[PDB]
Symmetry: C5
Subunit: 217 residues, 5 copies
Amino acid sequence: DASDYTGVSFWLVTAALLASTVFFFVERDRVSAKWKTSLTVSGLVTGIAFWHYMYMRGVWIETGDSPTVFRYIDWLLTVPLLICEFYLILAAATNVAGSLFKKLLVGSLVMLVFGYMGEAGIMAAWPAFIIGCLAWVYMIYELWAGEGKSACNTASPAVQSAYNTMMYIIIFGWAIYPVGYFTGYLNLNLIYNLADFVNKILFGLIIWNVAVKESSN
Amino acid sequence: DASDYTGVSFWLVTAALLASTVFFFVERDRVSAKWKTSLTVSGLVTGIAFWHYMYMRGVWIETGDSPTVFRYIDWLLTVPLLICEFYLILAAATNVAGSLFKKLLVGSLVMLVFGYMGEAGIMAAWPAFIIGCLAWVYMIYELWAGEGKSACNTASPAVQSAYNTMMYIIIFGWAIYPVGYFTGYLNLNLIYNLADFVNKILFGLIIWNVAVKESSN
Amino acid sequence: DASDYTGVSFWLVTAALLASTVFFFVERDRVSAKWKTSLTVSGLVTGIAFWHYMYMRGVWIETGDSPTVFRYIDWLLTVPLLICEFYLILAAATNVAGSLFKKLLVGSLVMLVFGYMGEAGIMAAWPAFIIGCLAWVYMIYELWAGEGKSACNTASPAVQSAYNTMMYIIIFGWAIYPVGYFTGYLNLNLIYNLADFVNKILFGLIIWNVAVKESSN
Amino acid sequence: DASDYTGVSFWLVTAALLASTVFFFVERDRVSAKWKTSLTVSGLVTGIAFWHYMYMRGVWIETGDSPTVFRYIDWLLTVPLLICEFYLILAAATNVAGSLFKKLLVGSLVMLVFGYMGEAGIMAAWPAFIIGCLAWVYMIYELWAGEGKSACNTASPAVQSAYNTMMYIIIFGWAIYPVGYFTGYLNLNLIYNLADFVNKILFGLIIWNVAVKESSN
Amino acid sequence: DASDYTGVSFWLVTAALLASTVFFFVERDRVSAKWKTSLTVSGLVTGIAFWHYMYMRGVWIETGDSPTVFRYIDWLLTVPLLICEFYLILAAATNVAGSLFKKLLVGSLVMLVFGYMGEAGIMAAWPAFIIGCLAWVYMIYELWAGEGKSACNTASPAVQSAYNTMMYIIIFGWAIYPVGYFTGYLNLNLIYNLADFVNKILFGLIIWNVAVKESSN
Ligand SMILES: *C/C=C(C)/C=C/C=C(C)/C=C/C1=C(C)CCCC1(C)C
Ligand SMILES: *C/C=C(C)/C=C/C=C(C)/C=C/C1=C(C)CCCC1(C)C
Ligand SMILES: *C/C=C(C)/C=C/C=C(C)/C=C/C1=C(C)CCCC1(C)C
Ligand SMILES: *C/C=C(C)/C=C/C=C(C)/C=C/C1=C(C)CCCC1(C)C
Ligand SMILES: *C/C=C(C)/C=C/C=C(C)/C=C/C1=C(C)CCCC1(C)C
């Protein structure tokens, strides 16, 4: 109906994710060979999100609850790719080690795992939330003042601007998710749909813009 | 049947939209790298329209009413892309700022939002209609005598002709939609199907023609 | 079963149309950029035909009648593209005006519209049939002794041979359809399936052969 | 179950055919423009076979019999393409007339038509079988000591080896099908599934190997 | 639910396999023509695995058992391709005979066939397990100290590193499967899902990394 404001968002986000997947997979022609992997991973993130959103909508229609397990599965598939996009754009613009890829991957996995262990009641909410936030802040530090920044200082100003915009998304766009978690252990589906919009489409658009600019110039 | 003249139009428009989506995604080979983004966005518009038309047909078969929410969702996804096609073709032919992209996007969003707020009864029909028409006229001015025209004067005559044809579509092809709104607050589905034909397929065909001409010459 | 000889033809034609669509969309690699649009339109015709044949088969399974409206929808989408293939191949081989594109399009539309107005009983069978035949003969004249021939005389002999073969298809392959109409107003589904084979697959194969020859040589 | 040994083969062959279709359509990048048509036709054969095998499996699940009509439809679509692959590989390696294409096509069609006329009881089993075998042997002669061999003697040794391997498949791999026919008019579904494996996947693999070798060297 | 830990793994692995298939088919642009076949085969393995995992999930939903036949069908299609990836990467980096391709294929087929003959009770568990392990060790020897190693010593150090990593996967990643077999004849579905992750996605990622490095450098 026109009063829930949740199914409307579900449909809007699902169609936008499909559109973004097609856009990312098609626009690899405008970028050089180095940036094609970044655009491919961006498109993979949007496609996996669309894939899981279809089943989440199906479960919403059948039962009418929140599929926490399905959202965490989508996260366990997409958050590592989104965090490794930093390594990808740094590799397509300068010499990045790959140690960064490893540590970012590990941090994201830890963050998700402990978050789920708090969601499922396996571990007490406070401890799991604190550990997940520590993993989040560790990824933030690696992208802000750690190895990621050291690789960022040897890149082109366009790549640096894209890196900073993506970092701001990781700090403020991502902060939506733990906040809801906090609220759950002391609207959410709508908030997560809009947040996935911001964190799945705008992220890839920033990557696409910088890749196209670098290839053209 | 052969008397409604509405389901026939639904099927015709849906098949035409699918055909147009395939055509736009396939014909990116004849255009240069700069015009590929324009053709991609055109194809995305047609694909989203087809996607939502399938579900609108499903709802028509099940219940048999007009899905206003679904049409406005399709609009909220396609109208911004269609209006940003102006920025796209100006970027693939001259130096356009991107401020135009921003302002056009904002105007289209305002137009749609206020239109829906009048459709759902949230805001009185008159005020919302006036605000939406002001947003429409603001987009018209930006494409006619504003920043869009300033970027248009530094383009090739073929690009200028495509720009003027698209502007005439924005003025007269788009005027179909508010008129129906006016009539609703004082056939429509058939009119909107034919209008989507005009405003979703002919628009992309104009873009494709100018892109192919520019790439070939 | 093995006695109707109609469902067998339905399946054969549907699979052949899908195969032809894939072939046309894939074989655009062997042709130059100019001929890619012709191959794309050919593939679009076969794809739309396949698309509508699936639903015609569904209606045949459910009810078991002849969907005149569905066939005329398929025609209203495919006949204009097939007739504009002449303009396409003339544009990819010499200087054709585009006035030809306009007049051919108009003639095909008139032919289909009046034919349907005779099929639905809106207009008397004789007058509508005569007007449709006049439109058919006008297209024949434009392709035989009119503007189309003038553009044909300035083309390569391979393109001229393809043009003449396509013209013979337009004269004799297309004459199947009005004949049935005549018989209806004084087997048909099987005849139309085989005719669609001839007029949808062989036509595109002639176009593909000439395009490949021109690109290779 | 694990005792029929027929549904297992159905699933294995169907998945292999889909895999082969994707492989053939994807691997056109490693071949020159001349060999792309051969790879496309190979992929079309596998795709049509997969398409019809899906419906054959559906009919097997519903009723549980042998769809002779469906197999002969698949043959009427695939056998001409498989036999014309000889003309294709000869055209992409030397000067072949195209008369070969015509005569091979005619022979294959005659073989299939008379075979079906014997299967459906229209014509006596003996006469139809003899005529079909004569058509088969005529195709064998045209590929062994006729026009096909004359075109083969002017090709590269790799193309000659591929031609001979394909000829051995036409002689011994194809002989599976009439033998079953003989047995039927005096296990079969399993035999035909494995034979389609041999005659639909190995054939295309031989073609792909020779095309890749010719393009690389 | 959140307690089985098996359906979660099923969904995770299925989505990851689809993502990997798309990634492998898309990333063929960054590799040279020689490595395209390796990436294609990798993508085929992931696609076949996804294809069969969908039906395995369907059978799990309907009945709720372990489809041994379906897993062995997936193996009979994917294990030969995975083992022939060694020949592929050796061919795209040095002169490998193809005798290796033959012997590896034969060994994998023997391993699978005898394994199934032990699973279905056709042959006693001990003898079939011993023969399958002998085939496994024969493949290990051919990749470690046999013809595969001789071809490996004439390759680039990056290709040698990829070869050694793949060999370690064949030794330790693959050892998961017979161990379960042993346990079955004296959790498993979860173990096989995670093992397919390791042996279907990481394998292709190693291949993709080495191919991209070789093409770039
Ligand atoms: C596309 C989906 C994305 C990008 C999801 C991101 C989710 C997070 C960044 C979640 C973070 C969490 C914490 C920092 C606290 C622990 C629980 C969380 C998982 C929600
Ligand atoms: C593909 C769909 C398109 C291009 C829809 C366009 C819709 C409009 C331009 C609607 C305009 C309206 C006004 C100017 C008045 C307010 C209400 C409206 C939204 C129908
Ligand atoms: C793919 C479908 C095609 C090419 C259909 C073509 C149909 C015609 C050329 C029909 C012609 C007719 C007349 C000339 C008389 C009026 C009625 C007709 C429409 C069947
Ligand atoms: C993919 C399917 C293929 C290649 C089928 C081939 C079938 C034949 C070569 C059948 C031959 C027959 C005869 C020679 C005798 C007449 C009856 C037949 C049709 C089975
Ligand atoms: C993608 C699936 C893969 C790579 C499956 C691999 C399976 C094996 C390597 C199985 C090996 C076995 C033995 C060595 C003992 C005999 C029984 C087995 C088949 C499970």
